[PDB]
């Protein structure tokens, strides 16, 4: 189905992106306190 | 839990790969 396969792609693409923007910041907060 | 321990896994990189290849060496040997 063309409808649900893109709603579950934007919400999947955002949650993998939220781990990147938090991953490149919390690791920068953790290194060299 | 925070990322305080998710650095040693990276720190111990070879020791994880050598513990996974030895698992496939018994998994394929089981087949």
Swiss-Prot record, chain B:
It is found in: Cell inner membrane. The chain crosses the membrane at residues 14-31. Belongs to the WzzB/Cld/Rol family. Confers a modal distribution of chain length on the O-antigen component of lipopolysaccharide (LPS). Gives rise to a reduced number of short chain molecules and increases in numbers of longer molecules. Homodimer. This is Chain length determinant protein. It comes from Escherichia coli (strain K12).
């Amino acid at each position: 189905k063309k409808a649900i396969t893109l709603i579950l792609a934007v919400l999947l693409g955002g949650m993998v992106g939220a781990g990147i923007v938090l991953g490149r910041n919390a690791l920068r907060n953790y290194n060299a306190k | 839990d925070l990322i305080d321990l998710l650095v040693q896994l990276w720190r111990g990189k070879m020791t994880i790969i050598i513990s996974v290849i030895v698992a496939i060496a018994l998994a394929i040997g089981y087949l």
